[PDB]
Amino acid sequence: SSQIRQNYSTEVEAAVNRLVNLYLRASYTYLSLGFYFDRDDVALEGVCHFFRELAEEKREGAERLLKMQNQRGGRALFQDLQKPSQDEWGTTLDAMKAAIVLEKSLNQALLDLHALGSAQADPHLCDFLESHFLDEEVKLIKKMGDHLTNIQRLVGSQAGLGEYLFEHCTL
Amino acid sequence: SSQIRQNYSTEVEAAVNRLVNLYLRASYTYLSLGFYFDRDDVALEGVCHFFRELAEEKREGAERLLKMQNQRGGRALFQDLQKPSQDEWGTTLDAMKAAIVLEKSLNQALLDLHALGSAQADPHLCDFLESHFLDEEVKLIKKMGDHLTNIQRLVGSQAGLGEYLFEHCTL
Amino acid sequence: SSQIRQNYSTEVEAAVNRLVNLYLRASYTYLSLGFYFDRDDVALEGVCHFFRELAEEKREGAERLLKMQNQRGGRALFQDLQKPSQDEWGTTLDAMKAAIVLEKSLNQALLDLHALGSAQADPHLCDFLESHFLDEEVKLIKKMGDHLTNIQRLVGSQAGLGEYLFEHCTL
Amino acid sequence: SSQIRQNYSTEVEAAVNRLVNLYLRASYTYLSLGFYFDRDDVALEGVCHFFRELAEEKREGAERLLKMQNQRGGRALFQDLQKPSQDEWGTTLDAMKAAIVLEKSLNQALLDLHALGSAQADPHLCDFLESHFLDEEVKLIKKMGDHLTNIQRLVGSQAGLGEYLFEHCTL
Amino acid sequence: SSQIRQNYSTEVEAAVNRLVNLYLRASYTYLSLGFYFDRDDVALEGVCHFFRELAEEKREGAERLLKMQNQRGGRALFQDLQKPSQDEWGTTLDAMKAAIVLEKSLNQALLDLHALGSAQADPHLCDFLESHFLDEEVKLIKKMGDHLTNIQRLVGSQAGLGEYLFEHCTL
Amino acid sequence: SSQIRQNYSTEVEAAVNRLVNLYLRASYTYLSLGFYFDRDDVALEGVCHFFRELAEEKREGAERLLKMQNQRGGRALFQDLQKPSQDEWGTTLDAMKAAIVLEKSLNQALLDLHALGSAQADPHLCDFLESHFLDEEVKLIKKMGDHLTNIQRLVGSQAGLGEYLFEHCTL
Ligand SMILES: [Au+]
Ligand SMILES: [Au+]
Ligand SMILES: [Au+]
Ligand SMILES: [Au+]
Ligand SMILES: [Au+]
Ligand SMILES: [Au+]
Ligand SMILES: [Au+]
Ligand SMILES: [Au+]
Ligand SMILES: [Au+]
Ligand SMILES: [Au+]
Ligand SMILES: [Au+]
Ligand SMILES: [Au+]
Ligand SMILES: [Au+]
Ligand SMILES: [Au+]
Ligand SMILES: [Au+]
Ligand SMILES: [Au+]
Ligand SMILES: [Au+]
Ligand SMILES: [Au+]
Ligand SMILES: [Au+]
Ligand SMILES: [Au+]
Ligand SMILES: [Au+]
Ligand SMILES: [Au+]
Ligand SMILES: [Au+]
Ligand SMILES: [Au+]
Ligand SMILES: [Au+]
Ligand SMILES: [Au+]
Ligand SMILES: [Au+]
Ligand SMILES: [Au+]
Ligand SMILES: [Au+]
Ligand SMILES: [Au+]
Ligand SMILES: [Au+]
Ligand SMILES: [Au+]
Ligand SMILES: [Au+]
Ligand SMILES: [Au+]
Ligand SMILES: [Au+]
Ligand SMILES: [Au+]
Ligand SMILES: [Au+]
Ligand SMILES: [Au+]
Ligand SMILES: [Au+]
Ligand SMILES: [Au+]
Ligand SMILES: [Au+]
Ligand SMILES: [Au+]
Ligand SMILES: [Cl-]
Ligand SMILES: [Cl-]
Ligand SMILES: [Cl-]
Ligand SMILES: [Cl-]
Ligand SMILES: [Cl-]
Ligand SMILES: [Cl-]
Ligand SMILES: [Cl-]
Ligand SMILES: [Cl-]
Ligand SMILES: [Cl-]
Ligand SMILES: [Cl-]
Ligand SMILES: [Cl-]
Ligand SMILES: [Cl-]
């Protein structure tokens, strides 16, 4: 009955709504991460800012998906947004570990949506994922792995601290 | 055990977390409102934009509250965000009615938080509500009542349409 | 006993004070008109603005008269300002009808003051009315008649609405 | 029956209309003060200008109140504006005394409206008074007391004139 | 006998003079803190500068209070300023602890002045505290708690130093 | 035990701390002078401003001395700051008399510190006094004597007022 809908499976429509939920959950998680690091007894405002920026990116992804849902003539359906998995997020290392786990769950969701879009022969969907999501996730996951390595190095030892300072201050 | 906390009741702390939830729910509602009006079979993009702007304002209010929670040494606690009350929002009139009901529920929540802050002799809280929330809500509710009146006039009759056009095009 | 007073009758002096009162009453009326249209259940802000501008013009006329009274060595005397004739002003059509009636009462007052100034052989008074009031009133009354005609056309019928839209949007 | 009205008592609504009247009366008083000082036999144009500026401020206060009345869903009701208490205002000292008495009556009215708003648990009203009226009145009353002191000094004696000139011309 | 004084209790007048003393004491304390960190055998000029800026803020607060005292028609009365509690201030951690204790004593004084102003039904006083003092203190106390946490982290351990460097140099 | 200290007597060190106290007392006195002239019943804002500027200069002198104390490796020690000698300061003439007495006490203190520095063969101290204090005091004392003469002339008589006006308005 939708007058623009063409080659748009009910399966993809549903999976897109689920991915919106996944992205909004991710944004909520990053909001909680950021405010934790803003606590006076944590007080790492740069970490708060890093996570605040990610909450925004994740919300923007959801909005992009919702725009696409309408462009294809699907019906956006919203579900409860579950609260984040933790109320306190431990150290910078713990938080960046939780963040890469999250990004990896979104990345797997995008890959699963491509597999569905391929099975449904929906190239507009594939193009959309490619254009806005797949490379963005890979780039973000690389940066977070980079961060994990640096944090481990900085917290580990004077040899690690040493090499980090040399790179940052001499190079 | 918080080293900055002063004159900040556990009651207000809790009510602030609940109000964050209320504001994030409101933002989610407005996201659903906006995307509904973006549907090709609805296609009122200006309405989508009006509600998109409100989703942003409501999120910003929640973020402001969360910032304040930390500034007072309270602990931000997040809860499930319930999905909006409807999946489809009817006419522009229905949506603007749902929106004023929502804003009125937030306004009542702010008034209830002032009553608690007064009972707890917490003037920083009162000041904060005054500075960022009370007048903003009143102004928004006035605009929405204005909108309700105009929509009713425009949809009602040629006499109503007539007066609207005169004001918009002659005055 | 006034050392600048020349050729300035007590009759004109009195009539000038009465006209000040008439102009301030008019300004008060337009204040009430404008705020009525600002009511959320009326919500024609352009009409509010049109009347707000007229309240200003009418006050300025009174101030001009008061300045002139002093320039001639008359004594400005103020009287009670009666409240406007109505508390609610009905439709845009009703309000613009009330406004033209008002302007016509001021115009008749100016004409009556010219007749007195002529009988008193006071050409400075005539010049003053000509320079600041007579043409202003005529222009305003023409605009209001124009408005009455347009409002009647717009509220009347699809043929009227039709012609208005053609003029506004095509021409 | 007003669709925006929330937490807005009939008592405050009425007191706001009365305060509008009080502010418009004040503006009318200052108009009479200013024109008196413009009389050729008085000829203190700076005093005329000081009072003209106050007539404007007082009108603006009334307009602010009327805007607020509508924003809260109250009904602006206008009453007769009584003419000022005097037709001639004596010396600069007499006029500035009459002016501080007036400002003190408005200030007391604002304080009485806060007491009512507090009894009615209306924090938007309190905020509004704070934001636009309480500090403005205090500042104005301080300036007028300053003026009274200076006028008394200047009119009093050569020792007073002396100190005024030293401050104005040397410092 | 003061010609501007209205609704200004002798109790608030006295408490304002005491708070001026409290603020000037605070400014003197911060002067001593800053010069200590300027000692060649301490040599933390950034800490000296942080405290120099606070000495200025505290003096400005006192001056603001004194201005307000005169605006209300109270009489500014000055008392001995006691010298700071210490002649030497230990480590950066010790000094920032002494500073938050101080700010908390000023904050409690402001809250006690609000309680008095409320008991005296003095809304201009409440507004003044809100506008210039309550939020400023909260913001300053949050920053100092942030500083305490960071200093403890940096002085504590290589894991703490590690996380601080990551936030500052990577994020 | 100070590693920079050279040719810096304990006698000068102590006298510098005492002079800091003297300068801060002077600044406090000028704060009280300035606020007195800001009283509505005094209302000489130019006098308030003149004294406010001097309070700043005196504080700056103390800060300069404290900086120098550290540059020489002395230990800044702060004492109680006694409140000013009066709570009310009479006429402009009385205040300017009190001010020149004060400046003369500071000037004598500087001269006494030079005598000590000379006896201690401390040329850096002499240079410092010369560079920042001796000429500044002389210039300030000359200006204040000038002011005393003018105030006496202006308050004295029409012949005095006469000559002042001629100089200010014709020359
Ligand atoms: Au954050
Ligand atoms: Au942040
Ligand atoms: Au694909
Ligand atoms: Au595909
Ligand atoms: Au770097
Ligand atoms: Au570096
Ligand atoms: Au570096
Ligand atoms: Au939208
Ligand atoms: Au939109
Ligand atoms: Au409150
Ligand atoms: Au409160
Ligand atoms: Au329009
Ligand atoms: Au139009
Ligand atoms: Au038009
Ligand atoms: Au209006
Ligand atoms: Au308007
Ligand atoms: Au005529
Ligand atoms: Au004539
Ligand atoms: Au047009
Ligand atoms: Au048009
Ligand atoms: Au058009
Ligand atoms: Au005037
Ligand atoms: Au004037
Ligand atoms: Au209030
Ligand atoms: Au209130
Ligand atoms: Au001056
Ligand atoms: Au002068
Ligand atoms: Au001069
Ligand atoms: Au310093
Ligand atoms: Au410094
Ligand atoms: Au208060
Ligand atoms: Au209060
Ligand atoms: Au940094
Ligand atoms: Au760094
Ligand atoms: Au770096
Ligand atoms: Au001053
Ligand atoms: Au001043
Ligand atoms: Au010397
Ligand atoms: Au020497
Ligand atoms: Au001069
Ligand atoms: Au002159
Ligand atoms: Au002159
Ligand atoms: Cl955040
Ligand atoms: Cl495909
Ligand atoms: Cl939207
Ligand atoms: Cl409170
Ligand atoms: Cl208006
Ligand atoms: Cl004629
Ligand atoms: Cl005027
Ligand atoms: Cl209240
Ligand atoms: Cl310092
Ligand atoms: Cl109060
Ligand atoms: Cl001062
Ligand atoms: Cl020497």
Tell me the C-alpha distance between F129 and F117, whole Å: 10
Shortest distance, CA E103 to any CA of chain D (angstroms): 26
| Number of other residues whose CB lies within 10 A of the CB of residue B90 | 12
Q: Distance, CA C3 to ligand 12 centroid (Å)?
A: 54
In the block, tokens 């009910």 appear at: A10
Token pair recorded at residue C151? 């409002």
Token pair recorded at residue A153? 């190095």
Tell me the C-alpha to C-alpha distance, in Å, between residue E44 and each of C34, E88, E100, E145, F90: 64, 14, 19, 20, 46
Token pair recorded at residue F98? 């009190």
Phi, psi (rounded to 5 degrees) for F123: -65, -25
Tell me the C-alpha distance between D38 and D55, whole Å: 15
In the block, tokens 């909108």 appear at: B147
Q: Which residue of B has its CA nearest to E133?
A: B124
Classified as helix, coil or strand, E6 is coil
Burial of F126 (0-12, 13-18, 19+ CB in 10 A): middle
Chain-centroid distance, C-alpha B123? 23
Contact by Cβ (8 Å): F148, F100: yes
Q: Distance, CA F127 to ligand 54 centroid (Å)?
A: 9
Contacts of D147 (CB under 8 A, 6+ apart): D96, F43
Tell me the C-alpha to C-alpha distance, in Å, between residue E33 and each of B38, E106, F78: 61, 17, 11
From the list B100, B138, B145, which residue is nearest D124 (CB)? B138
Token pair recorded at residue D126? 């309190």
Ranges of each domain in chain B? 10-170
Classified as helix, coil or strand, B81 is strand
- Mark the breaks in chain D: residue after which each occurs, C to N over 2.5 Å: none
Phi-psi region of E37 (alpha: psi -120 to 50; beta: other; left: phi over 0): alpha
Strand partners, E3: none
Determine the length of chain E.
171
Contact by Cβ (8 Å): D138, E72: yes
The residue among B127, B129, B41, B25 whose CA lies nearest residue B84 is B25
Tell me the C-alpha distance between D67 and C118, whole Å: 44
Neighbouring chains of A at 3+ CB pairs within 8 Å?
B, E
Contact by Cβ (8 Å): C122, C8: yes
Contact by Cβ (8 Å): F62, F20: yes
Token pair recorded at residue B85? 């009350």
Q: DSSP letters along C115-145, please?
A: HHHHHTT-HHHHHHHIIIIIHHHHHHHHHHH
Contact by Cβ (8 Å): B26, B58: yes
Burial of B50 (0-12, 13-18, 19+ CB in 10 A): buried
C169 in contact with D at a CB cutoff of 8 Å? no
Tell me the C-alpha distance between E105 and E25, whole Å: 11
Sign of CA dihedral C143, C149, C154, C155: positive
Q: DSSP letters along D71-108, please?
A: HHT-------BPPPS-S---SHHHHHHHHHHHHHHHHH
Sign of CA dihedral B101, B102, B106, B109: positive
Sign of CA dihedral F32, F37, F38, F41: positive
Helices D135-156 and D92-119, packing angle to 10 deg: 160
F10 in contact with E at a CB cutoff of 8 Å? no
Phi, psi (rounded to 5 degrees) for A81: -100, 115
In the block, tokens 């006098």 appear at: F47
Phi, psi (rounded to 5 degrees) for C81: -100, 115
| Number of other residues whose CB lies within 10 A of the CB of residue F171 | 5
Angle CA(B106)–CA(B112)–CA(B117) in degrees, nearest 5? Answer: 125
E81 in contact with F at a CB cutoff of 8 Å? yes
Phi, psi (rounded to 5 degrees) for F45: -70, -30
Tell me the C-alpha distance between B79 and A32, whole Å: 11
Sign of CA dihedral A151, A154, A160, A163: positive
Q: Which residue of F has its CA nearest to D158?
A: F155
Strand partners, B81: A81
Tell me the C-alpha to C-alpha distance, in Å, between residue D170 and each of B101, F46, F107, F142, F165: 64, 9, 24, 14, 11
Classified as helix, coil or strand, F63 is helix
Contact by Cβ (8 Å): D159, D104: no
Domain spanning B10-170: CATH superfamily: Ferritin, core subunit, four-helix bundle (1.20.1260.10)
D64 in contact with C at a CB cutoff of 8 Å? no
Rounded to the nearest 10°, the torsion over CA D160, D164, D165, D167 is 140
Classified as helix, coil or strand, F4 is coil
The residue among D97, D73, D87 whose CA lies nearest residue D13 is D73
Partners of residue E6 in chain D, C-beta under 8 Å: 104, 107-108, 141
E70 in contact with F at a CB cutoff of 8 Å? yes
Determine the length of chain C.
171
Strand partners, A81: B81
Tell me the C-alpha to C-alpha distance, in Å, between residue A140 and each of A91, C87, E109: 20, 64, 49
Tell me the C-alpha to C-alpha distance, in Å, between residue F128 and each of E36, F25, F117, F134: 21, 21, 11, 9
Determine the length of chain F.
171
CB atoms E83 and F87 under 8 Å: no
Q: What is the DSSP letter of A170?
A: I
Token pair recorded at residue B5? 């906390």
D119 in contact with E at a CB cutoff of 8 Å? no
Tell me the C-alpha distance between B39 and B95, whole Å: 14
CB atoms B167 and C91 under 8 Å: no
Expressed in Å, this structure's resolution amounts to 1.9
Tell me the C-alpha distance between C31 and C25, whole Å: 10
Helices (runs of H) and strands (runs of E) counted in chain E: 6, 0
CB atoms B70 and A41 under 8 Å: no
Phi-psi region of F86 (alpha: psi -120 to 50; beta: other; left: phi over 0): beta
Half-sphere exposure of residue D46, counting CA atoms within 13 Å on the CB side?
1
